[PDB]
RNA sequence: AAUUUAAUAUAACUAUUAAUAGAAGGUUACUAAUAAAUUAAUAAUUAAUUUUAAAACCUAAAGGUAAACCUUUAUAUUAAUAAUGUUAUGAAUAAUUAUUAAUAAUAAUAAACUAAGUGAACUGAAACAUCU
């Protein structure tokens, strides 16, 4: 059987397991450790759920590429360079930081709800929010509408 | 009127034609999976239309199909499982012997 | 006479629980139905 | 001659290094009578049938959900030039899980309406409040 | 040359983009030996996020009624069947236990 | 500005004396990770006092087994914004719902010391049975 009979697409989804369609990356092709750093918890604290989700899957795809390269390295040539391994470890660090952030975000939301279940704190919070900006001495006129829209969207389910 | 195998075949055809999954998606959603799969070099017994992976031991055939489709867009038409054995080894004769990992 | 084989019986002291204390690891399946005998069941 | 490089009896076995060893190691899929089935925690999907088959319960099958519009810009790593951001929570004993902190954040959201944080606007900021 | 060197405090070095100690000659506190100048930096790899995109904020706390994280995504964030966390007691439980 | 003696380590046990106190292992893998707060100290490191996040499977007793397996729908459900494909001629849908309230869970459970039940025989008596 001859391979001349095949039209292999250059955009075949199996190329996503390689970087720049390279069988195995060289030290020059790998990202130098000096210029690279894993994500920080505070930087992931203010990334939307979509952003964290997409970053998770990008991390997983890169880890898959590194995994195949590392398997070829440690199974066939049996070298002890351990570069792909630490690079994937950095990615894994970012991943568990993301997991931590998501958990803490949900727990903080739940704690806020439980705090505002209490009638006393709810009354205090609404009274302060009404006295501070709402019912001002006629200084703000138009932006009060934006404040009210945000209020009805946040404290209640009004869209 | 139509055999269930024929019905499955039309299901897969309809999935491909409409661009959706060529299979039935499950209800146990997993937003953040940390499973990793390893592409492997072809063997003499495979054809250019086949690809083999090293996958988690607790992984599943449907799991591989869904993972490939949603994460990479690769549609696996037929998946087949090969679970390997673990041979005994000992780094030295003066150590407890233990079986090597079983790779899937 | 005195009751040696009854007096020398000991039973583990279950802790007192307030309405907001931590749950015990395992829970009885059914509600308790009699008071507690100071000496418990004989074991001999 | 099993191995052409050993013409005389010296103690080497037909195969392997030792004929004996520990037998109290855990079992696996390849060992046991035909009746033995250990499994790999890979199928709790459906119900066996009274005859021998197996019916898949699709509400228990795992589906890997991915963003509808994926952002192909958050790379796995971050530019080393940006210093690691740090956070300071002064006035809150509960830290990031503090309802008072969340209420302050909601207050400022109400007043300002999705305003960028100092650490976000400045790539050269080492730490920020909240 | 310097015989010995001491460290009496810490400070954030912006050139190193990190916290470093005050390297000072053992003896006079004022005389401080500066840290070496880092080699100039320049990145080209595509696996590193740009600074602006990396630090751009896209999440704000804007609701107390709707969860920012979907219900079906929680199991991937925390184990629901965890043996390392337990609840408290109620009047029903304490009545069940006390004789 | 060196060089040797005598003590001292996160890195041994044993005996005594004096204080203080009554604290996980295994298997292999979708590896089992954290985050902050406080006052007094020339954006801050004293440490030490409070808070926290995660943590797969097995170690008799949610059920079963041939330990790390399997089987039980805590992604399991009344209520809701609309419905595809149909509802024995304005609502009720086997792939389901941004959702909201209610309802079953997790035995890691040491040793030594103490109290109690039943309790030998070897042996000694230069034999042996009372006795020991
Ligand atoms: Mg098979
Ligand atoms: Mg033999
Ligand atoms: Mg056999
Ligand atoms: Mg059990
Ligand atoms: Mg059986
Ligand atoms: Mg006794
Ligand atoms: Mg005698
Ligand atoms: Mg005799």
B69 burial class (0-12, 13-18, 19+ CB within 10 angstroms)?
A: buried
Q: Which of A66, A75, D43 is nearest to B101 (CA)?
A: A75
Residue E14 to residues A35, D84, E51: CA-CA distances in angstroms? 16, 12, 16
| Structural tokens at position E54 | 């990396």
C-alpha–C-alpha distance, residues E91 and E96, integer Å: 8
Q: How far is CA C35 from the centre of its chain?
A: 9
A96 touches strand F (CB under 7 A): yes
Conformational region of residue E98, where left means phi above 0, alpha means psi within -120 to 50, and beta covers everything else: beta
Does E touch D (3+ CB pairs < 8 Å)? yes
**What method was applied to determine this entry?**
cryo-EM
What does DSSP assign to residue E71?
A: G
B4 Cα–ligand 7 center, Å: 93
- Other C-beta atoms lying within 10 Å of the C-beta of residue B11: 13
C-alpha–C-alpha distance, residues A145 and A147, integer Å: 5
Cβ contacts of B30 on chain E, cutoff 8 Å? 75-76
Q: Which of A61, A22, A36, A85 is nearest to E45 (CA)?
A: A36
C-alpha–C-alpha distance, residues D63 and B62, integer Å: 9
C-alpha–C-alpha distance, residues A10 and A26, integer Å: 22
C-alpha–C-alpha distance, residues B101 and D29, integer Å: 12
Q: A40 CB contacts (<8 Å, ≥6 apart)? A: A97, D78, D84, D85, D86
D55 touches chain B (CB under 8 A): no
3-class secondary structure, D107: helix
Run of H or E residues at A25: none
| Structural tokens at position B19 | 């661009």
B36 phi and psi angles, rounded to 5 deg? -125, 140
- Chain E residues within 8 angstroms (CB to CB) of chain A: 41-43, 45, 47-48, 54-55, 57-60, 62-70, 73-74, 76-78
Run of H or E residues at A109: helix A84-117
What does DSSP assign to residue A76?
A: I
Q: Closest residue by Cα to the C1' atom of nucleotide F53?
A: A100
Which of chain F's bases lie under 7 Å from a protein CB?
1, 27-38, 43-45, 51-57, 62, 66-76, 94-100, 105-109, 115-117
A111 burial class (0-12, 13-18, 19+ CB within 10 angstroms)?
A: middle
- Other C-beta atoms lying within 10 Å of the C-beta of residue B12: 14
Q: Which of B70, B73, B33 is nearest to B55 (CA)?
A: B33
- Other C-beta atoms lying within 10 Å of the C-beta of residue D82: 21
Cβ atoms of residues D89 and D101 within 8 Å: yes
A149 touches strand F (CB under 7 A): no
| Structural tokens at position A153 | 């969207």
Residue D26 CA distance to nucleotide F27 C1' (Å): 8
């Amino acid at each position: 059987p001859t391979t001349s009979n095949l039209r292999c697409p250059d955009d075949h989804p199996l190329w996503q397991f390689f970087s720049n369609k390279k069988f195995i990356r060289s030290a020059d092709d790998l990202p130098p450790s000096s210029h690279i750093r894993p994500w920080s918890i505070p930087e992931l604290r203010h990334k939307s759920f979509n952003d964290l989700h997409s970053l998770w899957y990008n991390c997983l795809r890169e880890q898959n590429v590194l995994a195949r390269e590392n398997h070829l390295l440690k199974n066939i040539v049996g070298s002890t360079h351990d570069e792909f391994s630490e690079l994937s470890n950095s990615i894994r660090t970012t991943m568990w930081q993301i997991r931590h952030v998501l958990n803490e975000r949900e727990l903080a939301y739940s704690a806020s709800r439980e705090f505002l279940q209490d009638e006393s704190e709810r009354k205090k919070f609404l009274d302060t929010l009404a006295n501070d900006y709402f019912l001002n001495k006629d200084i703000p006129d138009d932006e009060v509408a934006s404040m009210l829209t945000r209020f009805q969207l946040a404290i209640f389910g009004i869209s | 009127d139509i055999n269930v195998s024929e019905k499955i075949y039309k299901w897969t055809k309809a999935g491909i034609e409409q661009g959706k999954e060529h299979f039935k998606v499950g209800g146990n959603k997993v937003y953040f999976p940390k499973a990793r799969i390893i592409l492997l070099r072809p063997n003499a017994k495979h054809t250019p239309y086949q690809a083999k992976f090293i996958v988690p031991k607790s992984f599943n055939k449907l799991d591989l199909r869904d993972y490939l489709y949603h994460i990479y867009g690769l549609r696996a038409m037929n998946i087949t499982t090969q679970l390997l054995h673990g041979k005994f080894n000992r780094m030295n004769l003066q150590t407890t012997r233990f079986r090597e990992p079983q790779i899937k | 006479r005195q009751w040696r084989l009854i007096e020398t019986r000991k039973i583990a002291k279950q802790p007192n629980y307030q309405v907001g204390d931590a749950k015990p690891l395992h829970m009885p399946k059914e509600r308790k139905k009699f008071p507690d005998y100071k000496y418990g069941e004989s074991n001999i | 001659l099993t191995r052409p490089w050993k013409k005389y009896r010296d103690g080497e076995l037909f195969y392997g290094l030792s004929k004996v060893g520990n037998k109290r190691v855990p079992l696996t899929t390849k060992q046991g009578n035909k009746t033995m089935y250990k499994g790999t925690r890979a199928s709790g999907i459906g119900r066996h049938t009274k005859f021998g088959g197996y019916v898949i319960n699709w509400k228990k099958v795992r589906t890997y959900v991915t963003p509808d519009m994926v952002n192909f810009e958050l790379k796995p790593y971050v530019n080393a030039n940006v210093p690691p951001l740090k956070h300071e929570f002064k006035g809150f004993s509960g830290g990031p899980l503090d309802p008072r902190l969340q209420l302050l954040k909601i207050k400022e959201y109400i007043v300002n309406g999705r305003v960028q944080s100092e650490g976000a606007t400045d790539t050269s900021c080492y730490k920020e409040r909240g | 040359a310097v015989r010995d060197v001491s460290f009496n405090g810490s400070y954030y070095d912006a050139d190193y983009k990190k916290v470093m100690p005050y390297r000072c000659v053992k003896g006079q506190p004022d005389l401080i030996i500066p840290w070496p100048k880092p080699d100039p930096i320049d990145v080209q790899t595509n696996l590193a996020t740009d600074p602006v995109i990396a630090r751009e904020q896209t999440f704000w706390v804007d609701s107390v009624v709707r969860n920012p994280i979907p219900k079906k995504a929680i199991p991937s964030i925390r184990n629901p069947h965890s043996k390392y966390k337990r609840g408290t007691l109620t009047a029903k439980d304490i009545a069940k236990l006390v004789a």
